[PDB]
């Protein structure tokens, strides 16, 4: 089962919590690649059964410059994705205001549009109560995998 990992990323913690995942993921027995800075030429190529998107907010409150162009390229080509599995982890930060991770709730909105089903509900990891992300994503990886395998 190939399970493309998307991240939106300002400075890389999205990005490396991504990258874990893809370790944990191929761990499990999963054909699972992070693509960041992903095109749609490289999703088709992929040919993805299953979806794991990876995205922090900007200060503005919109998806980083590295997954706002593919996110809007996806939503206007809207390919035949519909029924295929999906999950979502929203790095934000209560201390900002972002305590219910923007970019993350306009992937999950995306994923309603193509009719991708959220396997789990999204993690919402925060900056004011945890420094490792990494780490704290393991246990909504460990049921995600359950969720595609499964």
Do not use: C
């Amino acid at each position: 089962m190939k399970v493309a990992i998307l991240s939106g990323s300002v400075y890389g913690t999205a990005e490396e919590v991504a990258r874990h995942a893809q370790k944990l993921l191929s761990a499990a027995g999963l054909e699972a690649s992070h693509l960041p800075r992903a095109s749609l030429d490289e999703l088709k190529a992929f040919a993805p059964e299953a979806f794991l998107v990876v995205t922090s907010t900007t200060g503005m409150g919109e998806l980083p410059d590295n997954l706002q162009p593919l996110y809007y390229a996806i939503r206007d080509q809207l390919p035949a994705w519909h029924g295929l599995p999906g999950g979502v982890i929203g790095l934000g930060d209560s201390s900002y205001g972002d305590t219910f991770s923007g970019g993350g709730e306009q992937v999950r909105e995306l994923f309603g549009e193509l009719g991708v089903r959220e396997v789990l509900p999204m993690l919402r990891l925060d900056a004011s109560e945890t420094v490792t992300p990494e780490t704290d994503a393991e246990p909504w990886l460990a049921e995600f995998a359950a969720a595609l395998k499964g």
